[PDB]
Structure 1
Amino acid sequence: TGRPEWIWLALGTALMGLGTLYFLVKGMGVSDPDAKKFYAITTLVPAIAFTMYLSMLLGYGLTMVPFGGEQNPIYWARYADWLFTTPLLLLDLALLVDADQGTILALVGADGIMIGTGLVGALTKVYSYRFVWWAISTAAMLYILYVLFFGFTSKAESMRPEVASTFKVLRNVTVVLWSAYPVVWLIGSEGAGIVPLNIETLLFMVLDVSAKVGFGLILLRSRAIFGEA
Structure 2
Amino acid sequence: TGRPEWIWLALGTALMGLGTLYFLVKGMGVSDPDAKKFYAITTLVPAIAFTMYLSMLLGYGLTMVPFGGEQNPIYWARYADWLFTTALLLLDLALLVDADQGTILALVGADGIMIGTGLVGALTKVYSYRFVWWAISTAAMLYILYVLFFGFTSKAESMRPEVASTFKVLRNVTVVLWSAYPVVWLIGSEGAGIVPLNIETLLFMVLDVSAKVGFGLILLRSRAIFG
Q: TM-score, normalised by structure 1?
A: 0.97
CA RMSD, 1 decimal: 0.8
- Note the C-alpha offset of 1:68: 1.3
Q: Which residue of 2 aligns with 1:140?
A: 140
Q: Deviations over 1:40-99 (max 9, x none)?
A: 000000110000001100011111101111111111001111111001000000000001
- CA distance in structure 2 between the aligned counterparts of 1:102 and 1:6, rounded to whole angstroms: 41
Deviation at 1:160, TM superposition (A): 2.1
Deviations 1:130-153 (A, max 9, x none): 000011000000000001000011
- Give a deviation string over 1:205-225, Cα, whole Å, max 9, x none: 111111111111000010001
Pair 1:58 & 2:55 matched = no
Contact 2:184–2:203 (Cα < 8 Å) also in 1: yes
Question: How many angstroms apart in 1 are the aligned matches of 2:119 and 2:177?
Answer: 19
Matches within 5 A, 1:115-134: 115-134=115-134
Q: Secondary structure of the equivalent of 2:65?
A: strand
The structural deviation recorded for 1:14 is 0.7
| Aligned equivalent of 1:179 | 179
Displacement of 1:28 in angstroms is: 2.2
Q: For each residue in 1:161-188, what CA deviation from the matched residue of structure 2 results, as whole angstroms up to 9, or x when unmatched?
A: 2211111111111111110000100011
CA deviation profile, 1:110-130 (whole Å, cap 9, x unmatched): 000000000010001110000
Question: Which sections of structure 2, spanning at least 5 residues, go unmatched?
Answer: none
More deviation in 170-179 or 110-119?
A: 170-179
CA deviation after TM superposition for structure 1 residue 26, in Å: 1.4
Matched residues in 2 for 1:68 and 1:128: separation? 9
In 1, Cα distance between equivalents of 2:14 and 2:119: 25
Does the CA contact (< 8 Å) of 2:45 and 2:212 recur in 1? yes
Distance in 2, Cα, partners of 1:8 & 1:123: 23
- Partner Cα distance (1:58, 1:68) in 2: 27
CA distance in 1, matches of 2:161, 2:77: 39
Instruction: Please list, as runs of the form range in 1=range in 2, the aligned pairs for 1:13-24 lying within 5 A after superposition.
Output: 13-24=13-24
Residue equivalent to 1:219: 219
Aligned equivalents of 2:13 and 2:48: distance in 1? 11
Aligned residues: 227
Unaligned runs of 5+ in 1: none
Structure 1 runs of 4+ with >3 Å offset? none
Q: Once structures 1 and 2 are overlaid, which stretch shifts more, 46-55 or 22-31? A: 22-31
1:25 deviation in Å?
Answer: 1.4
SS for the counterpart of 1:224 is helix
Q: Give the percent of matched residue pairs that are identical in Structure 1 and Structure 2.
A: 100
Query: 1-side partners of 2:212 and 2:154: how far apart?
Result: 26
CA drift at 1:11: 0.7
